Amino acid sequence: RPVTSPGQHLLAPEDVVSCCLDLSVPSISFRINGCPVQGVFEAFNLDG
């Protein structure tokens, strides 16, 4: 599913992906090179 970020590009060298997981919501969020990723996973199963 396409997601909008500043300077969209397929993962390249000198790129940092920050992954955040909040189990309360639940939600998974991303930031690319310090820039927000305009998309989130949420409402997923917590069976493990």
């Binding site: 396409p2 300077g7 969209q8 590009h9 397929l10």
Partner: protein, 107 residues
């Protein structure tokens, strides 16, 4: 309609001009995701001249927007593509086409 989305950026200055040969690597998929063509399987870049009408309308216009070293996804409606008659055996009638194109150089 041609619809271009940048997978990877190019230089951002050098753009194809009419009468200028474009060298590409491309992979072709139907909208459902089925692949019907790829230059990399042949291991040979595909070369075409702009304005000549060798390639379909969609390729002409979409590569016109691209830059050297740029990788892009081109979505082409049937009317820019082979259209109603289609490409027998390969492409069905009224098929939207998805292409992954890397513009290697201009010559």
């Amino acid at each position: 309609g041609v619809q271009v989305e940048t997978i990877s950026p190019g230089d951002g200055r050098t753009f194809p001009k009419r009468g200028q040969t474009c060298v590409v690597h491309y992979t072709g998929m139907l909208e459902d995701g089925k692949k019907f063509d790829s230059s990399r399987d042949r291991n040979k870049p595909f070369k075409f001249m702009l304005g000549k009408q060798e390639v379909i309308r969609g390729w002409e216009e979409g590569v016109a927007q691209m830059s050297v070293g740029q990788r892009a996804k081109l979505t082409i409606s049937p009317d820019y593509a082979y259209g109603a008659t289609g490409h027998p055996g390969i492409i069905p009638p009224h098929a939207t086409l998805v292409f992954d194109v890397e513009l290697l150089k201009l010559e």
